[PDB]
Amino acid sequence: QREILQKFLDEFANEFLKLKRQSTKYKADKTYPTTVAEKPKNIKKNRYKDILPYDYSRVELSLITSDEDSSYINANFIKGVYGPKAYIATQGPLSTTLLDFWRMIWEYSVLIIVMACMEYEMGKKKCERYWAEPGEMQLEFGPFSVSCEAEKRKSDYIIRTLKVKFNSETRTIYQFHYKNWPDHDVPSSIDPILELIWDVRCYQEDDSVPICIHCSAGCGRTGVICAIDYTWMLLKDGIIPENFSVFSLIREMRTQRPSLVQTQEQYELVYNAVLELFKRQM
Numbered sequence: 001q002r003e004i005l006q007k008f009l010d011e012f013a014n015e016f017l018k019l020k021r022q023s024t025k026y027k028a029d030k031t032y033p034t035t036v037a038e039k040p041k042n043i044k045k046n047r048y049k050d051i052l053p054y055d056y057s058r059v060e061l062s063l064i065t066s067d068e069d070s071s072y073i074n075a076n077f078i079k080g081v082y083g084p085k086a087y088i089a090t091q092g093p094l095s096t097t098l099l100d101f102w103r104m105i106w107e108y109s110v111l112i113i114v115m116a117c118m119e120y121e122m123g124k125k126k127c128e129r130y131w132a133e134p135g136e137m138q139l140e141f142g143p144f145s146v147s148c149e150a151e152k153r154k155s156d157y158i159i160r161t162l163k164v165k166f167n168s169e170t171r172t173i174y175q176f177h178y179k180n181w182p183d184h185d186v187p188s189s190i191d192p193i194l195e196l197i198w199d200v201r202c203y204q205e206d207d208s209v210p211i212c213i214h215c216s217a218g219c220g221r222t223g224v225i226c227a228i229d230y231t232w233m234l235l236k237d238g239i240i241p242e243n244f245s246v247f248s249l250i251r252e253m254r255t256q257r258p259s260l261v262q263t264q265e266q267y268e269l270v271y272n273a274v275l276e277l278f279k280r281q282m
């Protein structure tokens with residue numbers, strides 16, 4: 001009646017293939033419409049054509065800074081342990097969505113940005129810079145002034161303290177840019193990911209505002225950090241559901257954004273990562 005001996009420690013392609021399914025039946029049934037993302041006037045706001053935000057969950061921008069700003073951005077709200085608007089899963093912005101990117105951050109009061117990519121990965125472009133680098137002059141993205149004061153550089157990730165001056169108003173955002181990525185079957189490379197989630201949660205915990213989290217397409221590594229962050233936030237309150245499961249968690253998280261964890265490797269890391277968390281703590 002109170003697992004304070006969290007016995008969860010106890011093939012993987014099979015649980016996952018079940019997630020592959022579901023999201024197949026979801027479409028054949030026209031369950032989660034992505035119509036707003038298919039509008040002819042947004043075709044250039046999506047980094048991939050087959051990765052569209054669900055309407056029902058899409059983040060809608062109201063903050064208008066021009067006679068052209070629409071209410072659109074590839075972004076979805078992921079609920080936390082207590083409710084919705086806990087997480088904001090998004091794609092790396094494009095040259096044409098930076099301003100959209102910053103409006104969102106601003107309109108929702110986001111204080112923490114976790115980017116799980118590298119400008120370039122494997123000789124390829126994955127993200128358009130939206131952040132400011134120290135030493136540089138300010139970088140204007142429409143009416144938003146992005147600056148950088150300092151940045152802690154750890155072994156696997158960087159902490160960028162950014163100063164965003166919209167009008168004459170100034171907010172301080174914290175960018176956690178995660179370069180290297182620790183794959184699955186390397187039970188030791190996971191540690192740093194927890195390093196991050198703990199570090200992140202050291203800046204923002206019991207705060208109304210969401211944590212903007214994005215990788216490139218906003219669904220691969222982005223889901224992992226959320227799923228993991230979510231199980232550990234549960235673990236942090238022992239509120240872990242009795243029948244809790246890494247599968248169950250990804251399932252519904254996969255209800256907010258299409259393919260929130262797109263590879264088995266990612267599915268397994270999410271798993272060995274929850275395991276370590278429980279093994280630990282105690």
Ligand SMILES: O=C(CCCN1C[C@@H](c2coc3cc(O)c(C(=O)O)cc23)NN1)Nc1cccc2ccccc12
Nearest residue numbers: 019020021117121126215216217218219220221262263
């Ligand atoms: O094999 C795959 C996935 C292949 C690739 N993906 C990844 C992607 C891809 C390749 O390298 C990447 C590097 C990145 O940094 C990101 C990214 O950040 O957004 C995405 C990719 N393009 N396709 N998976 C499957 C997923 C779900 C269901 C299936 C059912 C049958 C067979 C395969 C399935």
